[PDB]
Structure formats: structure tokens, C-alpha cells
Amino acid sequence: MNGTEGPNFYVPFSNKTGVVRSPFEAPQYYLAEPWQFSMLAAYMFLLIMLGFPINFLTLYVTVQHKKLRTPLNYILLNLAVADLFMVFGGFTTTLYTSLHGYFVFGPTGCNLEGFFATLGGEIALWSLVVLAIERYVVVCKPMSNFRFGENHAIMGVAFTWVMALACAAPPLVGWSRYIPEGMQCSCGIDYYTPHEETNNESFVIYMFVVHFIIPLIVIFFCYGQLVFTVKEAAAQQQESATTQKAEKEVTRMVIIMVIAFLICWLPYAGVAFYIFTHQGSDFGPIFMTIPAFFAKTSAVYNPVIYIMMNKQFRNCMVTTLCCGKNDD
Ligand SMILES: *[C@@H]1O[C@H](CO)[C@@H](O[C@@H]2O[C@H](CO)[C@@H](O[C@@H]3O[C@H](CO)[C@@H](O)[C@H](O)[C@@H]3O)[C@H](O)[C@H]2NC(C)=O)[C@H](O)[C@H]1NC(C)=O
Numbered sequence: 001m002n003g004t005e006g007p008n009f010y011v012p013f014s015n016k017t018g019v020v021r022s023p024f025e026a027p028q029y030y031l032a033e034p035w036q037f038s039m040l041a042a043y044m045f046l047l048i049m050l051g052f053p054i055n056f057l058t059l060y061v062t063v064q065h066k067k068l069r070t071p072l073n074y075i076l077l078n079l080a081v082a083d084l085f086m087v088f089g090g091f092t093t094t095l096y097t098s099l100h101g102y103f104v105f106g107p108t109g110c111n112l113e114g115f116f117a118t119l120g121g122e123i124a125l126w127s128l129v130v131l132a133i134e135r136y137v138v139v140c141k142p143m144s145n146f147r148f149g150e151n152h153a154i155m156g157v158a159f160t161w162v163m164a165l166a167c168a169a170p171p172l173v174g175w176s177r178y179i180p181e182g183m184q185c186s187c188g189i190d191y192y193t194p195h196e197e198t199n200n201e202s203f204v205i206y207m208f209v210v211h212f213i214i215p216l217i218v219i220f221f222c223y224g225q226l227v228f229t230v231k232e233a234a235a236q237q238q239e240s241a242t243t244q245k246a247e248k249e250v251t252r253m254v255i256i257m258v259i260a261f262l263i264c265w266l267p268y269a270g271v272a273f274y275i276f277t278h279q280g281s282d283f284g285p286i287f288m289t290i291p292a293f294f295a296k297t298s299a300v301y302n303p304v305i306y307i308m309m310n311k312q313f314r315n316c317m318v319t320t321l322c323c324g325k326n327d328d
């Protein structure tokens with residue numbers, strides 16, 4: 001016994017003092033220090049706080065601007081909505097949770113918080129997948145006379161939700177569950193226990209395989225052709241340098257996000273994986289809580305790349321904000 005086990009909780013602290021309670025019933029203040037809790041709640045607000053207005057504003061800009069109807073504007077407007085949903089659904093749940101030191105909103109709270117946070121992170125993954133292939137099709141242009149235009153950009157946003165709901169939602173009904181994490185304040189997938197009546201073994205494997213490994217091999221794949229193209233398979237293709245210049249500033253943007261995603265999300269992925277092998281080992285609440293709350297910048301950083309790296313958007317947004325002169 002290196003923590004505690006219950007119906008729907010695992011608290012990584014030896015109930016040898018009998019101080020350990022459920023994160024649905026009582027304040028887990030015993031798990032560490034008060035200042036550390038209202039430290040995370042102060043970080044949830046700040047996230048909500050740069051997130052809410054930059055994601056809506058992402059939406060607000062694409063809204064007003066009719067020239068933003070391309071593959072790239074689409075996927076990101078999508079992401080803004082993926083982010084905001086974390087901000088309002090997943091985040092306001094965890095915020096409140098940090099300031100009282102437990103899920104007072106009960107198990108159904110641990111759903112919401114953990115759902116959107118699994119959603120916004122996976123949408124972000126699958127969208128990258130779509131992105132990787134669009135750049136593939138538009139730069140490697142490998143199939144016959146084709147157009148990646150307005151129509152596929154709605155097939156793609158619709159594909160990403162499809163495969164984030166394929167991962168985030170199965171714990172809601174009967175395949176694995178959403179369970180408290182580290183300082184218990186954050187909630188995520190049940191890796192820490194078998195719990196056979198939900199199939200937490202099959203779910204996890206799948207969850208990594210389908211919704212981590214695979215999408216990466218595809219994004220690594222689309223990468224492998226673009227390295228090939230720009231070297232010597234984009235020589236005979238004749239693309240005018242003008243076209244390349246701006247289209248490169250659109251290639252780069254994809255992979256920045258590829259990396260940034262992995263930078264905020266590999267710490268998590270790896271830490272989760274590590275528990276799964278060592279089911280019920282010696283470790284502390286501080287272990288998962290860090291790559292957790294950190295990782296939730298995924299509701300913010302995406303727009304921020306789009307703000308920094310894309311000149312067009314940067315001149316659309318600005319133009320919304322003076323109201324006229326620095327359009328679409
Ligand atoms: C970690 O250990 C603590 C204490 O070592 C557990 O709390 C204890 O929970 C039991 C079971 O609910 C309490 O016993 C109750 O006593 C009355 C006797 O009149 C009985 O009628 C009730 O039905 C119940 O059996 C016990 O008082 C309580 N101990 C105290 C005072 O701390 C705790 O549940 C453990 N953590 C978990 C969630 O595994």
C-alpha cells in the first residue's frame with residue numbers, strides 16, 4: 001500500500017496515518033501544503049485568462065474577416081473552439097477544485113474537467129494530423145489534378161472532433177473512467193488501477209495507440225515527404241519562389257505546433273505511461289500534477305503561434321482592433 005484505493009479514487013499517500021480521505025468528500029490538504037493549492041487555482045485563472053480572450057478573439061477575427069477561409073484559418077478557428085471549451089468546461093471545474101482542495105462538484109465534476117481537457121488536447125492532435133497532410137497535398141502535390149479547398153476544410157475539422165470524442169468520451173459511458181490526478185485537483189484517464197468492470201487495460205493501450213502513437217507516425221510521415229519534396233522533389237514541380245515564400249511560412253507554422261504540442265504534452269504522456277507499467281508504485285502527488293497543469297496551456301499556446309507566425313492573420317486581427325487602419 002503506497003497510497004490508497006477506493007471505488008473511484010487513488011490518493012498516492014500512505015493511509016498509514018488514516019488521514020487519507022476521498023477527493024469527492026474532503027480537503028486533501030494533507031497531501032501537501034495550502035499555499036501549493038491556491039497556487040494552482042491562481043494558475044487556472046491565469047490560463048482561463050489569457051485563453052478566454054485570445055481564443056474568442058481568434059474566433060472573433062476569423063468571424064469578421066471574409067479572406068480567412070483557407071485550410072489554415074479553418075483548423076485554427078476549430079482549435080480556438082477546442083481551447084475555449086477547455087477554458088469554460090474543463091478549467092472552471094479545476095479552478096474551483098484547486099481553491100477548496102477537492103472535487104466538491106462530485107464525480108460528475110471529475111467528468112467535465114477531465115473530458116474537455118482530454119478533448120482540447122486530442123482535437124489539437126488530430127487537427128495537426130489534418131494539417132500535416134494538407135501541406136503534404138499542397139506542396140508535394142502527389143495525387144493527380146486536385147484541389148484542397150473549402151470543402152475538405154470542413155471534412156477535416158469534422159474528422160478531428162470525431163477522433164477526440166472517440167478518445168475523450170468512452171470513459172463517460174463505460175470504457176475506462178475519469179479519475180483525480182496527483183494533487184487530485186486535475187482529473188484524467190484511469191491508468192493507476194485495473195478496475196475490470198470498465199476495461200481500463202484495453203482502453204489505455206488503445207488510447208495511446210490510436211490517439212498518440214498513430215497520429216504521430218502520420219505526422220512524421222507527412223514530414224518525411226516534405227523533407228523529400230523541398231530538397232529535390234520540389235525542383236521539377238516548378239513552384240514559383242513567391243508561392244514558396246508565403247507557403248513556407250505556412251509549412252513552418254504546422255510543425256512549430258507539432259513540436260510545441262509535443263513539448264507541453266510529452267511530459268504528460270510519458271509520466272502517464274510510467275504509472276501504467278508500475279501500477280500502484282511509490283511516488284508522490286507532485287509527480288503527475290506538474291505535467292498535468294503545465295500541459296493545460298494547450299488551450300492557449302495554439303492561437304499564440306498563429307498570432308506570432310502568420311502575417312495575414314496578424315494584419316487581420318490588428319485591423320479588427322483599431323477598427324479599420326493599421327481587413328477581409
Ligand atoms: C484511511 O483510514 C481512515 C482511518 O484510519 C479511514 O477512516 C475510517 O473510516 C471508517 C469506515 O467508514 C470509520 O468507521 C465507522 O465507525 C462507526 C462505528 O460507530 C461505524 O458505525 C461506521 O459505519 C464506520 O464503520 C472510522 O471512524 C474512520 N476512522 C477515523 C475516525 O479516521 C479512511 O476511510 C481511510 N481512507 C480511505 C478512504 O480508504
Ligand SMILES: *[C@@H]1O[C@H](CO)[C@@H](O[C@@H]2O[C@H](CO)[C@@H](O)[C@H](O)[C@H]2NC(C)=O)[C@H](O)[C@H]1NC(C)=O
Nearest residue numbers: 001002003012014277278279280281282283284
Ligand atoms: C510500494 O513501493 C515500494 C518502494 O518503497 C515497493 O516495495 C518493494 O518491493 C519489492 C518486492 O517485489 C522489493 O524489491 C523492494 O525491496 C521494495 N522496496 C522498498 C523500498 O520497500 C513496491 O514496488 C510498491 N508496492 C508494494 C509491493 O508494496
